[PDB]
Amino acid sequence: DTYKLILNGKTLKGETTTEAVDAXTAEKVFKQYANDNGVDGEWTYDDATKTFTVTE
């Protein structure tokens, strides 16, 4: 399924999606993607929208 990541850095903001077999896989893509973007933060997931958010 399509999983989504909202990057809410202090100043750097964006979003990306990945196609993954499960939300394990998508998280362990996204938790690489945020750390390419230099956004270390706190992580939440919303299963209703299959969306991860990292907030700095």
From Swiss-Prot:
Per its UniProt entry, which superkingdom is the organism in?
Bacteria
Task: Give the location in the cell.
Answer: Secreted, Cell wall
Q: Where does the chain cross the membrane?
A: none
| sequence repeat windows | 2-56
The protein depicted here goes by the name Immunoglobulin G-binding protein G
Task: Give the gene symbol.
Answer: spg
Shown portion of the whole protein?
302 to 357 of 593
